[model samples]
Target: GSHMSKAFDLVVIGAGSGGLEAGWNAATLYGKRVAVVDVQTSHGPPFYAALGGTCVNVGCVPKKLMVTGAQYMDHLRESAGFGWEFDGSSVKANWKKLIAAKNEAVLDINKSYEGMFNDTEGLDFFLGWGSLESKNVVVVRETADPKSAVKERLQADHILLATGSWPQMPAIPGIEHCISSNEAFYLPEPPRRVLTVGGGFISVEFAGIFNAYKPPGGKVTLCYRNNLILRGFDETIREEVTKQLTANGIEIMTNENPAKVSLNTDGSKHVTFESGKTLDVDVVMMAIGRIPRTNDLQLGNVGVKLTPKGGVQVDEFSRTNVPNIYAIGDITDRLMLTPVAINEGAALVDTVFGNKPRKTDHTRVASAVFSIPPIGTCGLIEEVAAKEFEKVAVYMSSFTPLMHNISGSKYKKFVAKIVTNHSDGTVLGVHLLGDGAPEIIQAVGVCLRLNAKISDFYNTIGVHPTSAEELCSMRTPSYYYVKGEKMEKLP
Candidate 1:
């Protein structure tokens, strides 16, 4: 038993973005023996257990690839107005080919991750279900050979949980007929009629994708219980997204939700809304939200504190209540973005092992949604700033992009909104919608972190005939809040 027992300085559970970052850095930078254990296998084709977890297999990688693939259809249609003449009917998307290409890219990424874990010094990858056996111990059970068939135990000085999150669906009657983002990437045939339920990044992006690829007379419906989509975003931005979604031929079913789902005779999904309305569609996708994937981890064995939402309770240093246990990424629910997870992972490793105590500053992280016409945002939104600050000022501008001017497309437009402290010109937040918003917001996020002033953006010279330059050119305050009271100023 002693000879068979394995030991490591750090054992990382769930080799996703957060786990891999911590494992690689712990081994390479700190020269600590690290074991990375992944618990699941075979989400998509190539039919092999792979590393890099959900981001590589089912989440960001494949979703973004499909986003890129679906955007080509928009470009092709808009090309006619740009004086490029081709048979519009000739351009078509092959779902199987796209899936194959995307799967190949995912495979390449998985192999690279595997190579890193296998080749890197002091790092080992284990393919099995890893769970906490005790405070400083982990048990690995081969998922295939279960029923008490075989098991391996690992002892480590510190055990880290980065299990991330998984999409969830309401337990409606025929929910088995629905798909989440997990299964959306590998569908064999393109959806002719897709009803994507929910308004978050996944559902909205999928709604645009299905609408873009819908065959002749095909339909796409977006259903949400709220009046507007994207609940946590700025009111103005949500309004703009709703406007654009409507213009793009998407049926926006607001204040509505699926109460029941039934299978049609001809292989379609029949949905009855809570309002007693009925709609028929081929594909039913739910992207309501996600939950921490920690239930199966057996955290209770070591008595790690968890939030009611299943989030592992961690300190600023990413330490759990148990001294030898640490957690990061979506399991902590700090911020579910991949980069945030990576940051939290590395920061935890530094605090625990590198003798460099550090904490992640999550106040001003930039994020982007890949819906058609897209969105990028960072810092505070107007509503939050108005409440938190003594005095808040808002400036916003909306216009069609220069390319859209030539393409003559009403479906596409751009909006930029900046919120600032009224007393000084200190910028509090920046939100952008339409093309190139994500790239621009990334650079602006640094400014927000540094507490850049609105005067700084104003003083910067604007590049002519560009959409992003609008952020630099806004002058007058569109509105303001003084001591929590609204001060209206007409533009």
Candidate 2:
């Protein structure tokens, strides 16, 4: 009874972007009692929900740092384009050294998170998994230790679930031969030849990382079941990203999945597909996908319901079937993204405690695939536009980015695209693939979300000497696929 009397206005499960934001909002903004529980003692796990989780750890931070470092190699090749010259000397990356730096940075971020919570007197952070005890009561365990039967109970006005997801390893005969992004960073040795599988964002990014960061002779191959990678992106942009990736010495194998893997005597892996094709590589990295990490948490102990896909079912207000219990982030199966999780966590606090109603908006979320060259897009893709409009107009172009002018990197190819409804000229999508793609498309996403039209982009003055300028200069109409007809060329 004493433990149950340890009352709070809010209790949050999972100390992640969503959970932390919810705790902050409830405690600081509305001054409501708040507590956050996490399964891991600290962040920085390969693929677990912790203080710094995926984005802050193995996902974005380390990956992008390597991407930036790889760009420097390209810069060295293009020095002459900037009125400089290269003597053809080589630059080498020390894998272990870079890993050390990345680890230091990640640990620093974890400390920052700790400071944020420790300094806030109104909030409580628990290093454990929070389970539903009842509608308003929850049980939290400090560790999953088998000998520890002890559990801490808390009664609150609201309970929020922000547990995230982890990498899903496939079940295959030789799957043990492969790795994912989680282990890609700490590889025992740099693979001479790597095989990356999947067509989603993860696969694309890893393909780029292996090609760009690996030594000169290192080889990277992408295997996908779809005709193209990044399936939902505008076809023009997708084609360009694919072209650039292949140009960078990364092979793209498409429309094929039928396969099994076997170990080779030479310490390599062999892939055999139903199509009778075979690929041999030094390492296999599978980026098939990730699923919500809710298997262990005792959600069934209470009345909270999970979706068919194992995600917690929640409404617009982030409320689960149990009214007092709520869910956010990937766990809710709403939007499996970092920013979305942060936004929902913050919104839950504002709505329940601050008396400010804020609903999560998932429409028009922008994402980038760090392929050989990163590709970015906002709003609808031309493929999606076809279903909503009678006809669609597209503007597309490909050119060697200025950075490649002196680098003599013939592999450089960039494209800017705008997909518009022929009926009203409303821009349904703004997409790009090439150097500075992330920066340009991210800025355009603001306008697209506010209903910007194709004319708006056309009328906007171009920024000179920048890769982003190509977007404003687009005038030539490229081909667009119409309803039930073949893709036709532009007039």
Candidate 3:
């Protein structure tokens, strides 16, 4: 075991988005000596070799690249309507080249993170797997392989855990046969037929990707236990996304609980669902959910509390129950988005080192799902709005987008909804699905953060020849419902 006697003012474990932000802020903004330690392969299984956390490696960055590739396929299909003549079959997706480019981009991002850490004045880094030995003590092993690994011990004034989360696989027979999102990014070849065994954003996004690139008769199936996908999002967006995905030739299998997955003799996969239906596919990818990477951290030894959901318990300041120890990002489990974690990191540094106490405002945090048609939402959902407010005004608009008209695709339509308080007309929620939904909802999220009212939207001028303009054009309430009344019978 190798031991280091020097003590750091702050030590951040896990070099993901949150930890990087906190370390950078502490060192540069507050003039504190910071040390960041991380190991990409520590979590074990579903290998992730590069750094910058899930977003840079597998979640957002690479996923979006693949999504963009799928969009090109869409463009090829729609080119015919725009007076362009070419054999659609001639347009081919070189999966190997695409994956190689994505890997290169991720590696470049990893290098950028290294450069940032190197240029920071009061920061240092340790490339190792870190675990909490005590309140102020962290033990790190330098290699992913257990055999012949070197260990180092370090002491710090304060410790921060941003170890993030790992994909969770369902417990069943022959579960090892399926791949998680981590493996999906670097697959040797795109599977001709794929069954994404979950209904979350990853599952749907991959379904879209595979469906877009696969040859004719190549299938992409989205399986979920619930009747609807994206369960926690606004109900309107959920239904609309399902509709759009089905329209785009993606198969949606709801009320499906996986029993097991088996490798057949033909090198294919056989998925057994609880409904007694069996699905045969070239690949099976599980996107059920993700669990915090807290097992190896040994939080129990340090008296740091964890939620029942396996996330570290932390206050608004990102401080754990044991003072001098803090946790952020997915490990804290507040809101797992990268921007939210970055905000928490900034808030933590401000309060701890800068003498300025700041709390991350999670309310009205905008989010987008990179599905086929995509979805963007912020603030309260209609169900929550109706329950919280005495009376709620719901305005909804669904129409064919002009781009779809230009492409002569009658199946594509935009959906937008605003949930507002009837008493003060404050906009409680905004949900959108269709082209540019994410971009539009981002601006609406700013309005919600500022407590903008429904009338404010009405007062704003429209942007003609744009899908975003539909947001301001919703005049009368599609329906209004009072408390204790059935939402379905709104008047």
Candidate 4:
């Protein structure tokens, strides 16, 4: 049993956004000793744990690559609306090329991350999982060959737990027949007829991917327990997206839970729903959700308390009760977002080590859903706004994408909504659903995050030839309610 001990200032577990940002902030900004670790392998094609974290390696970036490509395919189909005749079938998504491009991009990201760490002389890195042995002590060993590997015990003044998350598999009848997003990441070939189960962003994005790529006879179905997809979203925009997706020939079956799955003689998947409904597809994917990756970290061994949601409980400063211990990101299950994790990690460094005082304001963070056309939102919705203010004002509109008018695809659906307090007209939310919505709403989100008022948006002049301008031009009173009127009504 070999032991390694050489720690002085700070150590961060899980070299994802949170971990890396914390390490870099400590090392560069504060000039503190930092150590980071992850399960990155440089084998043939870099394998599963190749790039770095989920977003960089497999989750968001690669998924977005496919999603954006699918969007372009639809764009071609809708080009006629833009006054240009798209005289051909949608461009086939060359899976080989798409996957190769994503892999290359992920590898580039990994190399860039390594470069950042290498440039910071005070920062060191390990390529394995680490567990807390005590309040100030950590034990890390190589993951693949743990038995023969030398263990490391490093004592730090402060530690950040950002072990991240992975998909959780439910125990169901014939559950083994289905694959999760992790396995679907490196799928060699695409399934012809795919059934994606879940109402989350992943399910919508993937159903769009398959339906866009394999159109006509090739089918894709979205199964969810909720009546509408993207629950907790703005009802008007949600309905618009649902209509557009269904218009693309993607079948949606709501309130249907998968009871069991059986393999057909032809190797297709036969899924039996709770309502006695049945569907045969080439693949069945489960995108229910993700779980914290902290189960094996043994934080109990270090006196760190964990929340019921499997996160290491922490204060506003990202400090756990164990003094030199902390946690962030998906492990918290509070935000499970890359940008949010980065903010938490950076704030932790600033508060613990920086010269100035700072804290993370978790509210009003902008987010997006990469469904077929993508959606963007910032701040609270009407339900939440009602809780804070006596009256809430909502303005929303849905329109067809200009491209759809030309392509004759009939899948054109774009919607935008703004929620504000009736008392002072402070912008409470900005929700957008449509083509290029993520890009368009990001600027608006920044404004909303800065506590911009609805007058700031309404008084602004409209930009010609942009969907975002619709937000500013909204004059008609579409819908609104006070604190007690109703919460379930849709615009």
Clashing pairs counted in every model? 0, 3, 0, 5
lDDT of 3 by residue, 98-162 (tens): 88888878887888888887788788888787777788887777654433254677788899898
Q: Distance (Å) between predicted and true CA of 227, model 4?
A: 1.7
lDDT of each: 0.85, 0.76, 0.84, 0.78
Off by over 4 Å in 2: 1-5, 41-49, 80-90, 142-148, 262-270, 274-276, 479-491
Q: TM-score of every model?
A: 0.96, 0.91, 0.95, 0.92
- By TM-score: ranked, best first: 1, 3, 4, 2
Clashing pairs in 1: none
lDDT of 4 by residue, 223-323 (tens): 99879888877877777778878987888888987989999999888999989999998889998788888865777777777788767787777777887
Clash list (residue pairs), candidate 3: none
Question: Model 4 — which ten-residue stretch has the worst lDDT?
Answer: 42-51
Whole-model lDDT, model 4: 0.78
Pick by TM-score: 1 or 4, better one: 1
Q: How much is 412 displaced in model 4, in angstroms?
A: 1.8
Better structure of 1 and 2 per TM-score: 1
Clashes of 4: 5
Stretches > 4 Å off in candidate 1: 40-50, 144-150
How much does each candidate deviate from the true structure in C-alpha RMSD? 2.1, 2.8, 2.3, 3.0
lDDT winner among the candidates?
Answer: 1
